[PDB]
Design a protein around this nucleic acid. Structure first.
Ligand SMILES: [Mg+2]
Ligand SMILES: [Mg+2]
Ligand SMILES: [Mg+2]
Ligand SMILES: [Mg+2]
Ligand SMILES: [Mg+2]
Ligand SMILES: [Mg+2]
Ligand SMILES: [Mg+2]
Ligand SMILES: [Mg+2]
Ligand SMILES: [Mg+2]
Ligand SMILES: [Mg+2]
Ligand SMILES: [Mg+2]
Ligand SMILES: [Mg+2]
Ligand SMILES: [Mg+2]
Ligand SMILES: [Mg+2]
Ligand SMILES: [Mg+2]
Ligand SMILES: [Mg+2]
Ligand SMILES: [Mg+2]
Ligand SMILES: [Mg+2]
Ligand SMILES: [Mg+2]
Ligand SMILES: [Mg+2]
Ligand SMILES: [Mg+2]
Ligand SMILES: [Mg+2]
Ligand SMILES: [Mg+2]
Ligand SMILES: [Mg+2]
Ligand SMILES: [Mg+2]
Ligand SMILES: [Mg+2]
Ligand SMILES: [Mg+2]
Ligand SMILES: [Mg+2]
Ligand SMILES: [Mg+2]
Lengths: 97, 99, 117, 305, 62, 287, 116
RNA sequence: UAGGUAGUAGGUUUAUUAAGAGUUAAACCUAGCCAACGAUCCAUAAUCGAUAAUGAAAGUUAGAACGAUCACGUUGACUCUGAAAUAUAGUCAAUAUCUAUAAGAUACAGCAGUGAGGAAUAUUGGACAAUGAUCGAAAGAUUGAUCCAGUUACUUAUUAGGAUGAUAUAUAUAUAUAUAUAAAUUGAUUAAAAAUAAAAUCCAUAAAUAAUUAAAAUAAUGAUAUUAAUUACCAUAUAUUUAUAUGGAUAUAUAUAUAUUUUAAUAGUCCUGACUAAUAUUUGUGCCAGCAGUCGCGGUAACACAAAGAGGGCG
């Protein structure tokens, strides 16, 4: 998770029925997601998140799908940088807000 | 500032008569005091118990007198003997029929 | 309220600001040059091609742009009085003063506009 | 699953068991009584820790989690007490290690449940006076003063404002005895601002956060290519953070009308460009909506804008 | 229209003035309306203590 | 505004903005707000209940919703701890005159402060105001009448009969003490009904020379030689966004309260999760 | 007044609390309808002075933000001002004594001046 | 509604017009033009915004209110004047009322108001003081435009009281005051509360009662108007809104010693099985009476019906 508060990129992931869409969030903007997702984020330390569930909204499958998306759909910036052989700066951090 | 009573209208009553619009029958609400009439304002007149239109007219005529403009009974507007512009056509026809 | 964000969040409208000079002046040289330059042809052409005819009753070209000589305009709208010293009576004097003031203002306005553009 | 939960104390207290039919007492009321301790002929709950006011520059904020709900101290000696099997009070058998070992931050924490809320320090009157002197007589800039002491520039300005008012009051002889006593009590309650202690000094590099910075951006620059704060600012299309901090730290024709002896008011004519001046036509009437605009007059009268 | 009449005992003849509103009696099929009960010849429901505005019932006034 | 009714009950442990004894007890015995074993909605509701009880109980819900701002505020130090953004949900109410006055400690409560300013005692930049919904700008002074400030922070001025009764008991205690000293100044209350000067003449202890317990200056609206309020300590929380001077009872509103890396300047008795839940609720109006 | 084009006050604001919108309009079109050109505003209720200020001897002000050059232009092309508007203009110093009627026509205390 | 179109589609000319054009009228040619990317025909609808609503937004909805555009002023046609009119004019006809009965007059979609229709929408108000408009050289005349008040919780907003507050007696430079008798409401007998709620106590403030003085407007004119606002026994005279000193107002003891109008507080309505916030319990009914947005509830133990208690919303 980016800055120990939100996911890295805007992820869009399908787990069985549920189609997930989870956008990253500016700091202060809270958790604005399906109640299951919110619950999972509270436990997993995600402060800021936007997103919306399409197709199935089966609670169990949401719970399973969202943790899968977190672990799998996300790429940390550092990993991406390593793969590509490039610098991958975060502009806000550099600025100092 | 008080002005002097002229030869043509030396009295309050005389002034009232001059200005008209039924300003007579108003000699009891204020007695014939020249200074009194002129110094008095709108609120005082209202308290005394004069009309709105009368009050307006008197004050205007006082002002004219102070400025030495010619005061006289400029009468209020009157509808035609036949009728108001709208009602004339019918009224006139009725009058013709009668006569 | 939604559509006010186009116009800088301005609820309500003003009437269009009315141009003091209603045609381009003679002093606006660049505009004149643009007008008088050879009009293009082909794909992005304006007029008629040299070989091609135009409808019988209709004009071939567009009408010419009447460039305002500003000094001339001033003279016409706001002529100074030829009989310079004929002035007696109070009302007449007042009228003359008013006229003078109107001359001043309209002159200034036009000249300013010319300079401003 | 939510019920209506009557708010009993989390800490343990002597509940009601049985009682005389007529008294009609409640467990909450009993708990409150216990918290208070016994009340005087005067009205004072003397045995309660939190009754009297501290004269220590150490705020006596609440620690219900630490003392486990037992608030009663002996007034003269400030030594803790409990409610025994008999109605009489007495000392506790086991001593509390939680109350003995407490942190610096939690002493300046008024509410137990919110760590973030802390009390601000109070300036000593001498310090305030010195600041005032610096700004007026010595003629130093406010930024320099702020750097020296560890206050923020608006804070410094506020202090200066208050000092001049206080002086004026003293001259007029408005500062009464009762007011002075109150001021002294308040001073005693709060902790004092130390200009040397680095942890107590206010952080003077706090700029406010704009909208463009919050929305996160990322750039794939070459592995070696450097990218400083200035570059980031340029990307975001802002001025740099340092410049904004520095800024924070640091015409039109008007006519007046002629005033004749009789007339009661002037006419101030300001210039204004056409297409920008008037009250616009077909604007949104907001008077019957709940987003209606309510301003205030020069005389403090509430006026619909 | 087939209108439901709520409340305990009612007062409605074969000619009474009655005002209809758009509720639905769910168990009766083919009746998609309610007579609003305070108004018209339909009188307010008697000795109603709870939910008085839902029926005609005025405030008893001690 | 919304009427004051059962604001300081114990069966609802609602922590109001006040220095009341019952309010203090409520604060004491609440602990946290329990959000465990609840649905998301239920949690949001409980947050709303607790947080709004403190922050603007006088405000109507619809009114509050209208004033409520989503866009919270913060400051980057550019020099670590995590800033508590969502403690700022009720930052907008500190901008109010009434709340600012309460923070300054020129009133015992927010309600009292409101009453004071209605009665035309507060000033802001000279101009007197009779409008709690007035909003301070940064740099604005505000100034309560010192007598009212004293009344707020002072003890309740006793009734004459009560004061006399208190004196009688004190006298008896003194007499008992002198008897005890000997071993190793009476008053009849039934006669002395309502003659204050007579009572003063009668009384002479070491700790009060003439004046009865509760009335040294009966004309003043507070207790005698002014002493503080009965439980003033646990609520005396000196704010950041105001600069205060208690001598004159003036106070400069210097900032709109804002959240730093360490702390928030919105003084609240609730943890950040509760404030987050409240925010969540009020974004959607509880959709 | 006479004319086709006329400089006049269009009323704005609420009941018991008028503000005016100095316009140039057609004579035929309505009082509060959309005009040719809005030149300025005018609040008739003067800025309230403090008790101390009153004691000192400082007069209230009536604010009249106004496009001067535009107004002058409109006057020049012959747009007759209303009785109140013309007075306002005179007070400002656009129009002369020439426009002052017999009713209007008293020692001056404070003289006009342009400032910035 | 699948074929529509015959001044129809286009050309040439003449009249009419300020002026283009099958726009009308006339004349003569060519065989076109539109259409399943919806023609023709029918139905419905005044249109729109920098207006209002709602949404994250794209949008969707309204077209009351503010403003811009159109059309109409009972219905249809035509004419006159005119820059511009099928004019709320005139002509003739149509429909329906008036007397005056006549090659008559009227048509409230101007303001009040009435009857009707309807679930449902106001005063037969006051003033031209303001801002405009028409007439007049001016004096000032008119103005149901307009400005004001009236009715109506239709909408919005501000107020609609704060602080203290769980007993009553009796006894006896310190201070945990301590005993004793009495009483103590609805529940309930303990985490079952109602209840800091009451009542008391301290403190104001509104309204009232007096005094004063704006502003909307100035040359003068104020409908609104027992105007807003301010002062509290009034005035002046110093300082920096507060404080003190004078001048007079006043009244009892014996001109000068203490005072200085008065003063409160009052909320509904919906809900508590889940969705949906509401755990203190109890009574009545018994698949009836009734409830119900949805799933459902009622057959003797009903958290769902009808109630009391307690509680939760909004106000
Ligand atoms: Mg005449
Ligand atoms: Mg009811
Ligand atoms: Mg004229
Ligand atoms: Mg032709
Ligand atoms: Mg045709
Ligand atoms: Mg033909
Ligand atoms: Mg079609
Ligand atoms: Mg239609
Ligand atoms: Mg439409
Ligand atoms: Mg409309
Ligand atoms: Mg309409
Ligand atoms: Mg028509
Ligand atoms: Mg009709
Ligand atoms: Mg017609
Ligand atoms: Mg009407
Ligand atoms: Mg009817
Ligand atoms: Mg008029
Ligand atoms: Mg009339
Ligand atoms: Mg209505
Ligand atoms: Mg309201
Ligand atoms: Mg009982
Ligand atoms: Mg009053
Ligand atoms: Mg239910
Ligand atoms: Mg629930
Ligand atoms: Mg029911
Ligand atoms: Mg089922
Ligand atoms: Mg039963
Ligand atoms: Mg029930
Ligand atoms: Mg009950």
């Amino acid at each position: 998770r980016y800055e120990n508060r939100t996911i890295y990129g805007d992820i869009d992931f399908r787990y069985h029925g549920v189609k997930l869409h989870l956008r990253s969030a500016k700091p202060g903007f809270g958790l604005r997601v399906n109640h299951v997702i919110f619950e999972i984020c509270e436990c997993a330390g995600i402060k800021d998140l936007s997103g919306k569930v399409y197709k199935s909204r089966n609670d169990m499958n949401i719970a399973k799908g969202t943790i899968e998306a977190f672990t799998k759909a996300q790429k940390t910036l550092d990993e991406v940088a390593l793969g590509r052989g490039k610098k991958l700066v975060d502009v806000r951090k550099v600025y100092y807000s | 500032t008080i002005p002097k009573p002229s030869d043509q209208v030396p009295d309050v009553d005389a002034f009232l008569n001059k200005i008209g619009r039924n300003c007579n029958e108003l000699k009891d609400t204020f007695e014939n005091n020249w200074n009194n009439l002129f110094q008095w304002d709108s609120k005082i007149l209202k308290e005394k118990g004069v009309n709105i239109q009368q009050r307006k007219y008197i004050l205007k005529q006082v002002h004219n007198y102070r400025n030495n403009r010619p005061i006289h009974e400029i009468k209020l507007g009157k509808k035609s003997f036949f009728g108001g512009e709208r009602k004339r056509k019918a009224f006139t026809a009725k009058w013709k029929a009668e006569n | 309220g939604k559509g006010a964000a186009k116009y800088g969040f301005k609820s309500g409208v003003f009437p269009t600001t009315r141009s003091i000079l209603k045609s381009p002046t003679t002093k606006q040289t660049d505009i004149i040059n643009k007008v008088k330059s050879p009009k293009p042809k082909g794909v992005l052409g304006i007029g008629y091609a040299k070989g091609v005819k135009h409808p019988k009753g209709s004009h071939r070209l567009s009408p010419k742009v009447n460039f305002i000589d500003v000094d001339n305009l001033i003279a016409k709208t706001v002529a100074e009085p030829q009989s310079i010293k004929s002035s007696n009576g109070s009302a007449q004097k007042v009228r003359l003063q008013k006229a003078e003031l109107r001359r001043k203002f309209l002159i200034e306005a036009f000249r300013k506009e010319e300079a401003r553009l | 699953f939510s019920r209506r939960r009557i708010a009993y104390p989390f800490y343990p207290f002597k509940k009601l068991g049985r009682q005389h039919p007529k008294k009609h007492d409640t467990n909450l009321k009993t708990a409150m009584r216990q918290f208070l301790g016994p009340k005087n002929y005067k009205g004072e709950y003397v045995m309660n820790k939190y009754f009297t006011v501290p004269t220590n520059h150490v705020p006596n904020y609440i620690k219900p989690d630490l003392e486990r709900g037992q608030s009663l101290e002996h007034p003269v000696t400030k030594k803790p007490l409990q409610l025994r099997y008999d109605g009489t009070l007495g000392p506790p058998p086991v001593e509390n290690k939680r109350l003995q070992n407490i942190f610096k931050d939690r002493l300046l924490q008024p509410f137990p449940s919110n760590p973030h809320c802390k009390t601000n320090y109070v300036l000593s009157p001498q310090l305030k006076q010195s600041i005032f002197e610096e700004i007026t007589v010595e003629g130093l800039s406010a930024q320099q003063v702020s750097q020296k002491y560890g206050l923020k520039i608006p804070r410094v300005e506020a202090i200066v404002k208050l000092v001049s008012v206080e002086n004026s009051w003293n001259r007029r002889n408005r500062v009464s005895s009762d007011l002075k006593t109150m001021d002294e009590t308040l001073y005693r309650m709060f902790p004092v601002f130390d200009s040397d202690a680095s942890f107590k000094r206010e952080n003077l590099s706090e700029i406010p956060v704009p909208q463009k910075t919050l929305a996160s951006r990322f750039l794939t620059i070459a592995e070696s290519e450097p990218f400083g704060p200035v570059d980031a600012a340029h990307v975001l299309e802002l001025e740099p953070a340092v410049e904004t901090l520095r800024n924070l730290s640091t015409n039109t024709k008007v006519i007046y009308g002629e005033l004749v002896e009789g007339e009661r008011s002037q006419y101030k004519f300001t210039n204004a460009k056409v297409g920008k001046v008037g009250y616009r036509y077909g604007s949104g009437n907001r008077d019957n909506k709940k987003d209606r605009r309510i301003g205030f007059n020069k005389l403090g009268q509430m006026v619909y804008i | 229209v087939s209108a439901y009449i709520p409340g305990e005992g009612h007062d409605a003849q074969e000619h009474s003035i009655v005002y209809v509103r758009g509720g639905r009696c769910q168990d009766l099929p083919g009746v998609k309306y309610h007579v609003i009960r305070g108004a018209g010849d339909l009188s307010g429901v008697v000795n109603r203590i709870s939910s008085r505005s839902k029926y005609g019932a005025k405030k008893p006034s001690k | 505004p919304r009427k004051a009714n059962l604001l300081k009950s114990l069966a609802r442990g609602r922590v109001r903005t006040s220095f009341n004894k019952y309010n203090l007890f409520n604060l004491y015995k609440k602990g946290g707000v329990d959000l465990k074993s609840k649905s998301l909605y239920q949690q949001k509701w409980t947050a709303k209940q607790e947080t709004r009880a403190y922050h603007g109980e006088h405000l109507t819900e619809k009114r509050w919703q209208t004033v409520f701002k989503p866009k919270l505020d913060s400051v980057a130090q550019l020099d670590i701890k995590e800033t508590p953004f969502l403690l700022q949900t009720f930052a907008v109410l500190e901008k109010r005159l009434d709340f600012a006055l309460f923070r300054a400690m020129f009133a015992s409560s927010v309600r009292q402060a409101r009453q004071f300013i209605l009665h035309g005692n507060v000033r802001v930049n000279g101009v007197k105001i009779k409008h709690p919904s007035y909003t301070l700008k940064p740099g604005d002074m505000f100034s309560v009448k010192p007598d009212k400030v004293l009344e707020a922070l002072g003890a309740k001025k006793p009734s004459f009969q009560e004061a006399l009764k208190i004196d009688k008991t004190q006298i008896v205690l003194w007499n008992k003490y002198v008897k005890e000293a000997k071993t190793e100044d009476p008053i009849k209350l039934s006669e002395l009904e309502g003659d204050e000067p007579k009572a003063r003449k009668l009384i002479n202890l070491p700790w009060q020379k003439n004046y009865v317990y509760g009335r040294q200056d009966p004309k003043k609206p507070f207790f005698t030689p002014w002493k503080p309020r009965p439980f003033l300590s646990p609520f005396a929380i000196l704010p950041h966004h105001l600069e205060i001077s208690f001598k004159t009872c003036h106070a400069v509103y210097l900032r709109d309260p804002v959240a730093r890396p360490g702390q928030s300047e919105v003084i609240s008795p609730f943890d950040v999760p509760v404030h987050e839940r409240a925010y969540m609720y009020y974004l959607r109006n509880g959709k | 007044t006479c004319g086709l084009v006329r400089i006049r006050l269009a009323r704005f604001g609420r009941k018991n609390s008028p503000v005016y919108n100095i316009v140039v309009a057609n004579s035929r079109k309505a009082r509060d309808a959309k005009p040719i050109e809005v030149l300025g505003t005018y609040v008739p209720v003067p800025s309230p002075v403090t008790k101390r200020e009153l004691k000192r001897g400082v007069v209230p002000i009536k604010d009249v933000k106004l496009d001067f050059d535009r107004t002058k232009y409109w006057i020049g092309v012959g747009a007759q001002p209303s009785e109140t508007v013309t007075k306002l203009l005179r007070k400002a110093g656009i129009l002369n004594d020439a426009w002052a009627t017999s009713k209007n026509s008293r020692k001056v205390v404070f003289e006009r001046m342009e400032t910035l």
